[PDB]
């Protein structure tokens, strides 16, 4: 027991005009027609602010092709914007493992994924990600390690996902954690006016960011795009 | 000191940027990069220095694409160049171009102490004639994997025409300062230095050009002063 959240309308850029400039100039003209349709129906959804930023989407797509990723895993699908972004970026024989507790969210965006003709690349698993990742390491052979991992699910579990993913991602592969700036609230020891769960995610991200910055197993780079993201490259 | 944008940033608070640098940048910054950054921040043109969080991002992009052969346009004291040389493998080679060697020799002691001076071939010249003669001598086997453009902003579109033939297919061209301190979001911006206003107009034109260029895919990233990654399609 015991719209409720304060971090929906706050962004990390100085100006609403600047963010709208990037979207109107650099994103929307380059957005796939099915990504546009998926984003538009998601914007009407009850959890629409969890939708990944559209400029962050194009950045993830650029990362995937520049590193020639072929096998990826996504944790946190929602309506599937970043998933469809990933699928459109990979080669036609690319494969994605998509994990989410709620497949009903996934089926909101699946028609757009189907019309985009990339559903065949996606293996959706309806479950909590942690048992799926633990079952993977039992069956994970080094020849089939993932090239790329996008983490965008339950925020407080990121550090737990990290311990599994640096063994499920190949050496030199990338793990991308979304929301590592958490609307800017991570820059302060305390932040008043937060919903209890928004406060836990703030504390969890402040701990995760120090963890990733000290983890010798990876090289990192925190990027102030969207709600922030941290790119991790496995060293060993 | 007569420029109106030196104290502007694109993030909403100085505290957020400071948090990123102290949490996720400085503990990962090479000792010679910190030394080069600290002596550059007292130079008279210190606001041209690339942001440290952006440098760590360029290094991540180089390693993820396994770049071997890159070119840098706009060296200054060599923070991005040293960042690039430290990211490339031992046999990596960089072509670094800058009209001013006086700036490069400030960072050269740090580059040598890092042990990566052998990767760098510095050319003191205007970049445009260097690129044009490269088009005359280049063989397809010698194409660059990665290009970082950070020099005179009004010439970015001219550099683009050369670079989409000098970087390999699937290679990356990254343009710095494409958000230009937030000024590009506005058709008119008051009180800018004449050179600052020239770059706002030039960047507003460059951003629409790149976004409509079928030769490349793009991603404009709101890091530092904004950068645009370009991936060559053909
Ligand atoms: N423990 C868990 N395991 C797997 N998924 C979870 C989870 N807890 C929450 N999630 C899911 O993570 C998602 C976060 S929203 C993710 C946004 C999406 N990647 C996009 O591109 O827009 C939600 O759909 C939620 O259902
Ligand atoms: N036409 C031109 N051709 C080549 N270099 C030029 C140029 N016009 C200006 N430059 C150089 O481009 C540099 C831009 S400052 C670049 C910053 C640097 N990349 C860093 O990491 O900090 C200046 O040093 C300037 O000397
Ligand atoms: O659940 C709230 C939420 C808000 C923003 C996000 O980016 C996200 O992944 C989740
Ligand atoms: Mg997210
Ligand atoms: Mg610059």
Q: Judged by CB atoms within 8 Å, which residues 55-94 of B form the interface with A? A: 56-57, 59-61, 63-66
DSSP 3-state of A194: coil
Residues with CB under 6 A from ligand 2: B 48-50, 74-76, 79-80, 97-100, 103, 126-127, 150-152, 155
Is B91 part of any known ligand binding site? Answer: no
Strand duo B167-176 + B227-232: pairing: antiparallel
Task: Note whether B12 contacts A17, CB cutoff 8 Å.
Answer: no
Q: Nearest CA to A107 among A38, A56, A60?
A: A38
DSSP 3-state of B227: strand
Cα–ligand 2 centroid distance for B48 (angstroms): 8
Sequence-separated (6 or more) residues with CB below 8 Å from residue A1: none
Is B172 part of any known ligand binding site? Answer: no
- How far CA B25 is from CA of A29, A148, B31, B85, B218, in Å, comes to 33, 22, 12, 18, 25
Residues, CB-to-ion distance under 5 Å, ligand 4: A 152, 178-179
CB contacts of A224 in chain B (<8 Å) are 11, 16-17, 20, 53, 222-223
* Element housing B85 (H / E): helix B79-87
Method underlying the structure: X-ray
Task: Note whether B17 contacts A66, CB cutoff 8 Å.
Answer: no
Task: Note whether A222 contacts B11, CB cutoff 8 Å.
Answer: no
> Per the structure block, which two tokens stand in for B171?
């290679």
HSE value, Cβ hemisphere, 13 Å, CA-based, for A224: 34
Sequence-separated (6 or more) residues with CB below 8 Å from residue A99: A73, A74, A75, A76, A77, A124, A125, A127, A129, A132, A153
Task: Note whether B64 contacts A233, CB cutoff 8 Å.
Answer: yes
Q: Judged by CB atoms within 8 Å, which residues 113-152 of B form the interface with A? A: none
Query: Ramachandran region of residue B9, left (φ > 0), alpha (ψ -120 to 50) or beta?
Result: beta
DSSP class of B120: E
* Element housing B151 (H / E): none
Query: Helices (H) and strands (E) in chain B — how many of each?
Result: 8, 7
Cα–Cα distance for residue pair B181/A152, rounded to 1 Å: 29
Task: Note whether B23 contacts A213, CB cutoff 8 Å.
Answer: yes
For ligand 2, atom 13, the nearest C-alpha belongs to: B74
A231 touches chain B (CB under 8 A): yes
The CA distance from B221 to the nearest CA of chain A, in Å, is: 6
CB contacts of B231 in chain A (<8 Å) are 62, 65-66
10 Å CB burial of residue A131 (0-12, 13-18, 19+) is: exposed
How crowded is residue B203: how many other Cβ atoms within 10 Å of its Cβ?
25
Q: Nearest CA to A5 among A185, A153, A189?
A: A185
CA of A26: which chain B residue's CA is closest? B211
Cα–Cα distance for residue pair A18/B226, rounded to 1 Å: 11
Helix B52-64 and helix B79-87: axis angle, to 10°? 30
> Per the structure block, which two tokens stand in for B225?
């002063």
Second CATH level (architecture) for the domain B14-232: 3-Layer(aba) Sandwich (3.40)
CA dihedral B178, B181, B184, B188 (to 10 degrees): -150
Using an 8 Å Cβ cutoff, are B43 and B84 in contact? no
Q: Which CATH superfamily does the domain covering A16-234 fall into?
A: Vaccinia Virus protein VP39 (3.40.50.150)
Q: Judged by CB atoms within 8 Å, which residues 163-202 of B form the interface with A? A: 170, 172, 179, 182, 184-186
Q: DSSP H helical segments within B138-193, as ranges?
A: 156-166
What φ, ψ does residue B214 adopt, rounded to 5°?
Answer: -75, -10
Bridge partner list, B97:
B73, B123
* Element housing A196 (H / E): helix A196-214
Is A107 part of any known ligand binding site? Answer: no
Is B1 part of any known ligand binding site? Answer: no
DSSP class of B216: E
Residues with CB under 6 A from ligand 1: A 50-52, 75-78, 81-82, 99-102, 105, 128-129, 152-154, 157
The DSSP result for B6-42, as a single string, is TT--SBS-HHHHHHHHHHHTGGGS-HHHHHHHHHHTT
Using an 8 Å Cβ cutoff, are A13 and B11 in contact? yes
Q: Nearest CA to B223 among A62, A211, A208?
A: A62
* Residue at token pair 């015991």: A2
Using an 8 Å Cβ cutoff, are B60 and B136 in contact? no
Task: Note whether B27 contacts A214, CB cutoff 8 Å.
Answer: yes
Instruction: Number of A to B CB contacts under 8 A, please give it.
Output: 150
How crowded is residue B40: how many other Cβ atoms within 10 Å of its Cβ?
21
Using an 8 Å Cβ cutoff, are A29 and A58 in contact? no
* Sequence spans of domains, chain B: 14-232
Task: Note whether A224 contacts B185, CB cutoff 8 Å.
Answer: no
Q: Is the dihedral of CA A16, B224, A221, B157 positive or negative?
A: positive
- How far CA B103 is from CA of B34, B94, B199, in Å, comes to 17, 17, 22
* Residue at token pair 């990876």: A218
Using an 8 Å Cβ cutoff, are B55 and B79 in contact? yes
Using an 8 Å Cβ cutoff, are A165 and A145 in contact? no
Is B126 part of any known ligand binding site? Answer: yes
């Amino acid at each position: 027991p015991g719209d409720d959240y304060a971090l929906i309308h706050k962004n990390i850029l100085h100006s609403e005009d600047l963010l709208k400039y990037i979207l109107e100039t650099s994103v929307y003209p380059r957005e796939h027609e099915q990504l546009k349709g998926l984003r538009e129906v998601t914007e009407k959804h009850e959890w629409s602010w969890a939708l990944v930023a559209a400029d962050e989407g194009l950045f993830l797509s650029m990362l995937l092709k520049l590193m020639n990723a072929k096998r990826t895993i996504e944790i946190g699908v929602y309506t599937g914007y970043s998933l469809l972004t990933t699928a459109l970026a990979l080669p036609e024989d690319g494969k994605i493992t998509a994990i989410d507790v709620n497949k009903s969210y996934f089926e909101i965006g699946l028609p757009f994924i189907q019309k985009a003709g990339v559903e065949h690349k996606i293996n959706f698993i309806e479950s909590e990600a942690l048992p799926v990742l633990d079952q993977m390491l039992q069956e994970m052979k080094e020849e089939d390690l993932y090239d790329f991992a996008f983490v965008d699910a339950d925020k407080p579990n990121y550090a737990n996902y990290h311990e599994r993913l640096v063994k499920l991602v190949r050496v030199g592969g990338a793990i991308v954690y979304d929301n590592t700036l958490w609307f800017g609230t991570v820059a302060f020891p305390e932040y008043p006016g937060l919903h209890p769960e928004e406060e836990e995610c703030r504390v969890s991200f402040r701990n995760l960011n120090k963890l990733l910055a000290a983890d010798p197993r990876v090289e990192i780079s925190q990027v102030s795009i969207g709600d922030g993201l941290t790119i991790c490259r496995r060293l060993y």
